[PDB]
Paper text:
We used X-ray crystallography to structurally characterize multiple states of our designed systems. For both the AS1 and the AS5 systems, the crystal structures of the hosts alone and of the host–effector complexes closely match the design models (maximum 1.3 Å Cα root mean square deviation (RMSD)). The unbound structures show an open hydrophobic cleft in the new designed state X poised to bind the effector, and the effector-bound structures show that binding the effector causes the two switch domains to register-shift into the designed state Y. Crystal structures throughout the facilitated dissociation process confirm our ability to design excited states and large register-shift conformational changes.
Numbering used by the authors:
A (entry chain B): 4 to 23
B (entry chain A): 0 to 257
Amino acid sequence: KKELAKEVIETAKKLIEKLA
Amino acid sequence: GSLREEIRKLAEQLSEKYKDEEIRELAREAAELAEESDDPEVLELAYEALKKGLELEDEEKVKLILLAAVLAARVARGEVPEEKLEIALKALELAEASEDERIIRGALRAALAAARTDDPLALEVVLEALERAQASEDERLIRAILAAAYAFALLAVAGASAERLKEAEAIVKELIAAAEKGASPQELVLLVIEMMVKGMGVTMETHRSGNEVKVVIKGLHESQQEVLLEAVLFAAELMGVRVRIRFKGDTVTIVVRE
């Protein structure tokens, strides 16, 4: 779960940078 | 520390900049979820998203940025079912990989709505739908799947019973199978309408005067109409179909344009 949560946060940051 | 102060400041600033109630709600939710978590990584995520919302002027991009941040913060705060994490991850991967803004917004909206529910039945249906979309390289089919998943997830957060979600699951599977075989976008939009009608426990009549199908929906409370509209209008945009929606007293009429 901890590994999935870190991957979710990492992917969300990449998406936000793309959207910006 | 300094991030916590800035997150609260930015959320208030975002609420002054943008009049749209959804940005104001998501900005407030990001601040709340960031505080409820003790993860620094969630704090930097919320800070980064709120800051970009202030640097940008396009409401649409800002909405999507806040949707991503709230989704991630909701599933990373505390300990959630593994299915919720997998839903968020696969939606975020679908959004990051696509150039079509409709897929980004469909993935985020379906996953955040699923993240709000606690029913394991609802989580497995949304996850299974996102698994199918990730396996496909057809962005047209992906948009059909996301339209079905978002409609279903909206039924779940609108309080549909487990029994009505089991019937809605069947329609989700029917819609995906039909889309894979090449059904018209109009046929798929009718399936979303049927899903919402049965899921909200109301009734409908279908009339095919000529080339254009008309659905008449009866029995919805006025404040329940918004759920059906959001599901149908969103599905119609995702699958490239125009609908005309007219209202009487308790009656909603939807013409699916061909």
